[PDB]
Amino acid sequence: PGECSVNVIPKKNLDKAKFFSGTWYETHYLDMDPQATEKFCFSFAPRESGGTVKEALYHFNVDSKVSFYNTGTGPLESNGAKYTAKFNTVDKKGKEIKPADEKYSYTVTVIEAAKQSALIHICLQEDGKDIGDLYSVLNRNKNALPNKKIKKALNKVSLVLTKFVVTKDLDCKYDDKFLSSWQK
Ligand code: HEM
Numbered sequence: 001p002g003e004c005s006v007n008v009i010p011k012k013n014l015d016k017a018k019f020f021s022g023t024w025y026e027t028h029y030l031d032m033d034p035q036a037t038e039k040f041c042f043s044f045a046p047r048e049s050g051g052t053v054k055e056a057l058y059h060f061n062v063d064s065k066v067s068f069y070n071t072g073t074g075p076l077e078s079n080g081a082k083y084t085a086k087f088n089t090v091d092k093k094g095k096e097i098k099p100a101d102e103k104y105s106y107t108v109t110v111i112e113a114a115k116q117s118a119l120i121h122i123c124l125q126e127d128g129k130d131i132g133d134l135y136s137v138l139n140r141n142k143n144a145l146p147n148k149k150i151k152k153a154l155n156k157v158s159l160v161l162t163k164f165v166v167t168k169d170l171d172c173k174y175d176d177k178f179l180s181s182w183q184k
Pocket of ligand 1: 042108
């Protein structure tokens with residue numbers, strides 16, 4: 001029902017220092033629930049050290065004009081391109097406003113990365129059971145189109161970019177300072 005996709009393959013030999021740096025913007029996304037049709041914008045700043053990922057997350061609800069901020073922490077898998085995190089809720093200043101709920105986690109897989117582009121998959125879980133998943137194309141630049149390598153990776157798993165929501169058209173509002181100041 002809320003079962004996460006199979007055939008999500010972590011990139012071989014991801015350059016960690018490059019991927020886990022700076023800010024990434026979602027440019028296209030595909031929620032695997034066809035009824036999940038609310039428009040959102042997303043950006044994040046993932047960092048890694050000693051086999052642990054610490055990331056700052058930003059979402060913006062286009063419909064309601066409400067933004068929310070989270071941080072996530074968890075171990076990086078031995079393959080170096082997949083991690084599972086627990087998360088809390090913070091305000092725009094980075095201060096915790098709601099503690100992590102033990103029953104929830106998410107698993108991010110980096111499927112492909114090339115130049116200024118990447119393709120990721122996220123699986124949300126409750127008590128270790130799948131509750132839903134999503135694919136996202138990322139770019140360093142809000143308005144940029146994906147590298148062909150990202151399209152190749154989509155093709156390998158029988159997805160086509162035309163099915164994704166494109167957010168550059170949406171009235172996105174970003175908190176870039178929250179992400180740029182992450183772990184500063
Ligand atoms: C790229 C496109 C993405 C979209 C469109 C999206 C959309 C959403 C939506 C609609 C919600 C629920 C908001 C609500 O209940 O009002 C949500 C929650 C959440 N998402 Fe995303 N998401 C994306 C990517 C990600 C990624 C890549 C991560 C982790 C790296 C992530 C982590 C979370 C977390 C932790 C929550 C729950 C926050 C809370 O309950 O306080 N999301 N997202």
